[PDB]
């Protein structure tokens, strides 16, 4: 409750006072100490004018932000620092790409809130694991699909329905319904299976050109932007890409270990005895990440640098690939590992 006191009474720090490069695509939000992230969320909301536009109650917003942060567990990748960095990228898209020409204010607001909430209570395992392990989440959502994403949305709703945390309780009934419906679609769009299903519709929209008067184009654009925020760790330098691969594979291999112990054969990328990290990262960059930022570049010319950084990071994997072969003897001069 002392974090809350300071967050409410100390005042909202200007965005520049965090870092002079905070609003740039070159900035790495993971460099920000975890203890300064809740204040950074308030600074970003204030800078986007959401607090004033929607007359958000300060005690309510302060409680909401801390409740969202508390709602994340500590697996190697799907933790609060992932949600914070994804939310930071949404802010970057707002600051650098002129979203206001494409989306409604409420849609841009829903995107940011969804970014903060999109992986709430993640346990470090994927959708297939929920079903295979017969988890409570699969009992609740397996028949509807996107098990984890349905849970993240339900966790966001449970936070909003906690006394003193409903940042939208003063909204009109229509605006309240709209907001929760947007959060549903945006959070469900974080399932990469959903992205791969709509990819041809995203290509078609970029091809014909975005139509601001087409409601389906608004829905498709919000899906693309959310996916762009979720994979944004790949738009920085090699240092971020390398570190993120360590976190992702530590999480994946922990799942694979659980599947093996259950008598199940894990997917290749989740099996520490079979996974070849450079090949898997090249495949993910080439077939998932690069086409996303290419679509983003096609719709927004100012997003060109993002695609170029992703392409550069993909090329760095090919460059370091030879290091994954043990040439000579290991550092200890022993072949005991055999
Ligand atoms: C349905 O087809 C698929 C799904 C996943 C797949 O690649 C895995 C995802 N992996 C990633 N690798 C590096 N940076 C990543 C990710 C992700 C998503 C993960 C946290 C889940 N986000 N970021 C920033 C490697 C290949 C194909
Ligand atoms: Mg997710
Ligand atoms: Zn995520």
UniProtKB/Swiss-Prot annotation:
Active site: 78 (proton donor)
Outcome of mutating residue 234 to I: No effect on 3',5'-cyclic-AMP phosphodiesterase activity. Decreased 3',5'-cyclic-GMP phosphodiesterase activity
Residues noted as binding Zn(2+) in the record, renumbered to the chain: 82, 118-119, 230
Described function: cGMP-activated cyclic nucleotide phosphodiesterase with a dual-specificity for the second messengers cAMP and cGMP, which are key regulators of many important physiological processes. Has a higher efficiency with cGMP compared to cAMP. Plays a role in cell growth and migration.
Comment, domains: The GAF 1 domain functions as a dimerization domain. The GAF 2 domains binds cGMP, which acts as an allosteric activator.
Family, similarity comment: Belongs to the cyclic nucleotide phosphodiesterase family. PDE2 subfamily.
Protein name: cGMP-dependent 3',5'-cyclic phosphodiesterase
Full-protein residues shown: 579 to 916 of 941
